Structure formats: C-alpha cells, structure tokens
Design a protein around this ligand. Structure first.
Ligand SMILES: COc1cc(-c2cncc(-c3ccc(C4CCN(C)CC4)cc3)c2C)cc(OC)c1OC
Ligand SMILES: COc1cc(-c2cncc(-c3ccc(C4CCN(C)CC4)cc3)c2C)cc(OC)c1OC
Ligand SMILES: COc1cc(-c2cncc(-c3ccc(C4CCN(C)CC4)cc3)c2C)cc(OC)c1OC
Length: 284
C-alpha cells in the first residue's frame, strides 16, 4: 500500500557535547539535522517531543521540527531529534569571524525577538505560552536569508538547568517566583539581552568593532561556577560593558538602551519580547 522511507544517511558530525552529537544527514536528497541524545540528556528528548506532540510549532524563527525517533537497540534505546539543517551553523559560530553592518545586525536581532515573542505568546483557538529556559548564541542558528531561528526546546516549559553564564539574577539567588509562568519569560528576556550584547559588539561603526566574547568574559572564569555567576550578577550587580564607540552610532546607542532594559534586577521591570520587537522596528 506504501513505502515509508525512514533511512537517514549521517554524513558529518557538526556538533559533539554532553548532550550527544548533531549530524548533517540526508533524507530523500534533502539535508536534515539529526541530534543523537546522550543517556545524560534523554529527558531533553522527552520534553521537546512532549511539547511538539502538544503543539506543532511552525515559525520562520523557530528551528523547524521534522521528527522524533526512538529505536530499540540490543541493550539500549536510541533517541534522535530530526530538524531542518542550517549550513551556516550557530550564531555563536557565525559571530567568531563575521562582522555585521547596521542592516544585518538589526535583521539578526529582530528575527530572534520574533522567534522569542512567538514562543512566549499564548494563542487561543493556537498554542500555549512557552518559555525556552536556555536561550544563548549556541541555541540560535543563522539562515541564508540573514534571519536566525531559535533551537533546543529540551528545557522549555508550557503554560538539566539553564547555561550558568546566561542565568538571570533571580535564578542565581533562588528568588525566582517559580509558581508564576511570567517568571520564566523574564528569565528568557535577561538571556536575550546578553545575546543582543554579543551581536552588537560585532556590528562595525566608524571602522571599529569588538572581538567576539561571551557575556561576562572579563569577570568570570572560562567555565564559571554557579557561585562565580551569583557573585557577579547578584552581589556586585555587574552588567556587560557598553563601549564608548557605541554612543557615536545611532543603532548601537538604541541597542545599548534596549539591552539595559532586559537586565533590570527586578524581573517585572524588564521589557517584554513584544515590546522589544516594537522598539527594534523603530530603529533606523
Ligand atoms: C515512521 O518514521 C518516519 C516516517 C517518515 C515518513 C516517510 N515517508 C512517508 C511518511 C508519511 C507521512 C504521512 C502519511 C499520511 C498520509 C495521509 N494519511 C491521512 C495518513 C498518513 C503517510 C506517510 C512519513 C511520516 C520519515 C521519517 O524520517 C524523515 C521517519 O522516521 C523518523
Ligand atoms: C516528516 O517530514 C516529511 C514528510 C514528508 C511526507 C511524506 N509523505 C507524505 C506526507 C504527507 C502527505 C499527505 C498528508 C495529509 C494531506 C491532507 N490530508 C488528506 C491528510 C494527509 C500528510 C503528510 C509527507 C508530509 C515529506 C517531507 O519533505 C518533503 C518531510 O520533511 C523531511
Ligand atoms: C543548537 O541545537 C541544535 C542545532 C542543530 C543544527 C541545525 N542545523 C545546522 C547545524 C550546524 C551545521 C553545521 C555546522 C558547522 C559545520 C562546520 N563549519 C566549519 C561551521 C558550521 C554547525 C551547526 C546544527 C547544529 C540541530 C539540532 O537538533 C537536530 C539542535 O538541537 C535542538
């Protein structure tokens, strides 16, 4: 009655980590990305699979779902997540050697805000509200059209811990209002402001650009502890540096203001993803 072609050819490993591996694969001539989960990270496969079984997200700035596969092996289960493949790789990867102009910088950050607002918003008749809980430049992919997409819903919550470098102050000091879904949106907004800072640094103005650095590179170790982050973010209340050269450029002046309004200690003071979108559409 019909053939169900399930063979995927795994062509090259494009990522290896505590999570397992990501491969470029081929299905029926077409590139796909295949995340093979470590035993360490099986719950991330279950969480993302449960979310996609609840709501089939479809948005240009969310990494496109194709399949969740569980295959029985002699003595183990193998768990694969299959998505669209973005050959340019992660934003983290891309910013290491690429500099940006005003148009490309804004297109990148507005695309991320668009994806994030789509996750956060409840739609009736639709989708539940979703918080990501691990937003960072390695969890954002660059598309050939200059927009990005948000990846990895293995920690997402619908209405493993986040990456410590990107944790909001209320996560580090354990004051987060865990029974208020809005709390999780506000944690994502903090992380978004860090991502905005990482991107803005790579935008050229008046022949000047900063080298790629991760958030807090100048105040925590290469592999920071939870306590390292708490002392910087909560006790001393440090924030990422805004270079003087940004204040000669109208785009970077507006982006500095925006990232400041993602980093308030008081989570309820931070901008919403929808407000960030509106602000970004009025820059330049
Ligand atoms: C099981 O596993 C995998 C399957 C596939 C795949 C391969 N060919 C065809 C299909 C297909 C889609 C949809 C229907 C519909 C037709 C309409 N009718 C109302 C009910 C059924 C039938 C068949 C699929 C889903 C790809 C895979 O990987 C890319 C799979 O592995 C993860
Ligand atoms: C998982 O992913 C991919 C799947 C497929 C694919 C293969 N066979 C059949 C289908 C299909 C056909 C028909 C229906 C519907 C149509 C209307 N109504 C009557 C209900 C049934 C659904 C599904 C698809 C979608 C192709 C893909 O790429 C070209 C996929 O992406 C990698
Ligand atoms: C963050 O998370 C996930 C990401 C992906 C994913 C999707 N498209 C493409 C990629 C990719 C391709 C190529 C490179 C390299 C190749 C070497 N070159 C020198 C630089 C570029 C990097 C990255 C990935 C990693 C899939 C996922 O799941 C299936 C992810 O997990 C949710």
């Amino acid at each position: 009655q019909r053939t169900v072609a399930r063979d995927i050819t795994l062509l090259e490993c494009v990522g290896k980590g505590r999570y397992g591996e990501v491969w470029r694969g081929s299905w029926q001539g077409e590139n796909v990305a295949v995340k093979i989960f470590s035993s360490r990270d099986e719950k991330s496969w279950f969480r993302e699979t449960e979310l996609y079984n609840t709501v089939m997200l479809r948005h240009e700035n969310i990494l496109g779902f194709i399949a969740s596969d569980m295959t029985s092996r002699h003595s183990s289960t193998q768990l694969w997540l299959i998505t669209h493949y973005h050959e340019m790789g992660s934003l983290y990867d891309y910013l290491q050697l690429t500099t940006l102009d005003t148009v490309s910088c804004l297109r990148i950050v507005l695309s991320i805000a668009s994806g994030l607002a789509h996750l956060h918003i409840e739609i009736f008749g639709g989708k539940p509200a979703i918080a990501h809980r691990d937003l960072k430049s390695k969890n954002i992919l660059v598309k050939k059209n200059g927009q990005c997409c948000i990846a990895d819903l293995g920690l997402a919550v619908m209405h493993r811990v986040g990456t410590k470098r990107y944790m909001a102050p209320e996560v580090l000091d354990e004051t987060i209002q865990v029974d208020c879904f809005d709390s999780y949106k506000r944690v994502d907004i903090w992380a978004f402001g860090l991502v905005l800072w990482e991107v803005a640094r790579r935008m050229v103005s008046n022949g000047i650009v900063e080298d790629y650095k991760p958030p807090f590179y100048d105040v925590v170790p290469n592999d920071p502890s939870f306590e390292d982050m708490r002392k910087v973010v909560c006790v001393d209340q440090q924030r990422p540096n805004i270079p003087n050269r940004w204040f000669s450029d109208p785009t970077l002046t507006s982006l500095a203001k925006l990232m400041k309004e993602c980093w308030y200690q008081n989570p309820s003071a931070r901008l919403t993803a929808l407000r960030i979108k509106k602000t970004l559409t009025k820059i330049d």
